[PDB]
Amino acid sequence: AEAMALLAEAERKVKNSQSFFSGLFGGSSKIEEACEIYARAANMFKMAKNWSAAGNAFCQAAQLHLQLQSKHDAATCFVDAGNAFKKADPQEAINCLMRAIEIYTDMGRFTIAAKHHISIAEIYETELVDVEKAIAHYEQSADYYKGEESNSSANKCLLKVAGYAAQLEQYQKAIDIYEQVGTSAMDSPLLKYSAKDYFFKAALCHFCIDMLNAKLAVQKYEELFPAFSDSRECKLMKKLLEAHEEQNVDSYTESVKEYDSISRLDQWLTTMLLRIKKTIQGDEED
Amino acid sequence: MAGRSMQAARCPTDELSLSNCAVVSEKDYQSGQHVIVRTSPNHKYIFTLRTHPSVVPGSVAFSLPQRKWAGLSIGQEIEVALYSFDKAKQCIGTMTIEIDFLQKKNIDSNPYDTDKMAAEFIQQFNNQAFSVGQQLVFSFNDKLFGLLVKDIEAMRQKIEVGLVVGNSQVA
């Protein structure tokens, strides 16, 4: 029941046997027992809430597992290590996670590789706050999902990608994503309903737009006045496009106030709306 | 005097942009001298200079209001030449000005005493050039406004461009 002791025995058995120890056969049989040791250690380290210790312990058990020839259950250990570091004081987490994917990827387990990949960028954005490396992951991950026939998940990821791409300034690179995720959302009459927001975003994102890129994305849109859901998408957009093309930072800022009534603006929208709000002012003042 | 070549720039701070003065470098002109901008063979304007350690030698900085008036762009070439007014027949004794709120997003119903305005107007725009139809900005009590000279009288004839002095009344 002594973690420190286990961590020691594990060492005394994790070494290619030779001479009187090796006997006739051996190898993987020992290193595996060692892995079980470090695992038990990390287990009680997490029992005593030492987490950090538990994490590094799992790191040892995992690294050892690789030295045995068993990438599968190994990578799973790397995962455990990540869950430990994450709910711990060190920052390691990220590392372990990367070391996990390299396995699931090389092994061919892209399904799970993407399952974790999204959690990866999710941490590289909620923790390290490094969106530049988060988007890269949300994207490479969505590629895998979209490959596993799994359209729904692929779209979840794409939504993440585009969503944070507009915050980083990548507006056009965002509208493209919204267009694609929009044309690939109508093939499912179980998503048509939400296809609105997509057009709303793609039309809001402006790469210093000067013409009707948005007026064109709003016209491509098929609104059904008797299909009231659309009241939270185009109807507003048109009024904003006019308030933009007419250098009026009042009609736009008034429409954002009104629409903010029938439909609560979320963080994202707010930030972008203000960005477009200033593209008008600077144009009134040129 | 022969008129040299310069380059239109942007106003340094937000104080000189409220004085309706062409900010220049000390290595070129001196604060107090008047000049005449020359863009095209048919476009002539008159501004007031005001040096500042932020100006780059070989360029004159103008404020947005002045740009929309003299039709100047940021990065264009223009000719600047010294200009001396005729205080013997061009002095401004009475200049009507169309005042409104500059920053639209900053308009209230509170009443503003004109007497205090015309007082802080000359105390800041003394010894400067003002043309009929010129667009600038006024700062009364840390509040920005949008002026617009409509008529100018001598100290009573009607002139196109004059020079505001100390004993200059403003309406």
Swiss-Prot record, chain A:
UniProt xrefs under Pfam families: SNAP
Entry GO MF terms: protein-containing complex binding; SNARE binding; soluble NSF attachment protein activity; syntaxin binding
GO BP: apical protein localization; brain development; intracellular protein transport; membrane fusion; neuron differentiation; positive regulation of ATP-dependent activity; protein-containing complex disassembly; regulation of synaptic vesicle priming
Subcellular location: Cell membrane
Key words of the record: Acetylation, Cell membrane, ER-Golgi transport, Membrane, Phosphoprotein, Protein transport, Transport
InterPro entries per the UniProt record, alphabetical: NSF_attach (IPR000744), TPR-like_helical_dom_sf (IPR011990)
Gene3D superfamilies noted in UniProt: Tetratricopeptide repeat domain
Phosphoserine found at: S19, S22, S188
GO cellular component: glutamatergic synapse; neuromuscular junction; postsynapse; presynapse; presynaptic active zone membrane; synaptobrevin 2-SNAP-25-syntaxin-1a complex; terminal bouton
Role of this protein: Required for vesicular transport between the endoplasmic reticulum and the Golgi apparatus. Together with GNA12 promotes CDH5 localization to plasma membrane.
Family designation: Belongs to the SNAP family.
Assembly description: Interacts with PRKCABP, and disrupts the interaction between GRIA2 and PRKCABP, leading to the internalization of GRIA2. Found in a complex with VAMP8. Component of a SNARE-like complex that contains at least ZW10, USE1L, RINT1, STX18 and NAPA/SNAP-alpha. Interacts with VTI1A. Interacts with STX12. Interacts with GNA12 (via N-terminus); the interaction promotes CDH5 localization to plasma membrane.
Protein name: Alpha-soluble NSF attachment protein
Species whose genome carries this gene: Rattus norvegicus (Rat)
UniProtKB/Swiss-Prot annotation, chain B:
Positions carrying N6-acetyllysine: K105
Coiled-coil ranges per UniProt: none
Locations listed in the record: Cytoplasm
Function: Required for vesicle-mediated transport. Catalyzes the fusion of transport vesicles within the Golgi cisternae. Is also required for transport from the endoplasmic reticulum to the Golgi stack. Seems to function as a fusion protein required for the delivery of cargo proteins to all compartments of the Golgi stack independent of vesicle origin. Interaction with AMPAR subunit GRIA2 leads to influence GRIA2 membrane cycling.
Subunit structure as annotated in this protein's UniProt entry: Homohexamer. Interacts with GABARAP and GABARAPL2. Interacts with GRIA2. Interacts with PLK2, leading to disrupt the interaction with GRIA2. Interacts with MUSK; may regulate MUSK endocytosis and activity. Interacts with CDK16.
UniProt record similarity statement: Belongs to the AAA ATPase family.
Protein name from the UniProt record: Vesicle-fusing ATPase
Gene assigned in the entry: NSF
